[PDB]
Structures are given as structure tokens and as C-alpha cells.
Amino acid sequence: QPLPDCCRQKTCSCRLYELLHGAGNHAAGILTL
């Protein structure tokens, strides 16, 4: 999977993606399409 954006710009937590990727990864996969 893709790396964290906030981690690249250091504008927020990197594990932020894991939050949704674990509590609902499909939510982002479908909403994005």
C-alpha cells in the first residue's frame, strides 16, 4: 500500500491511515472509487 502523506510533509500523524485502514479500509476504497 501507499505510504503516509502526513509523514512526508510532517503535517500530521502517519499512522492516521492505519486508523481507517483498520476500522474501515473499504470506506476509503469505495468512497474514492
Q: Which residues contact 19 (CB under 8 A, 6 or more apart)?
A: none
Contact 5, 20 (CB under 8 A): no
Residue 30 is placed in which grid cell? 469505495
Q: Which value, to the nearest 10 degrees, does the dihedral of the CA atoms of residues 26, 11, 13, 3 take?
A: 50
**Which method resolved this structure?**
NMR
Closest CA to 17 of 33, 2, 9, 32: 2
Q: Which residue is associated with the grid cell 481507517? A: 20
Alpha-carbon span 33 to 16, nearest angstrom: 20
Residue 18 is placed in which grid cell? 492505519
Contact 1, 7 (CB under 8 A): no
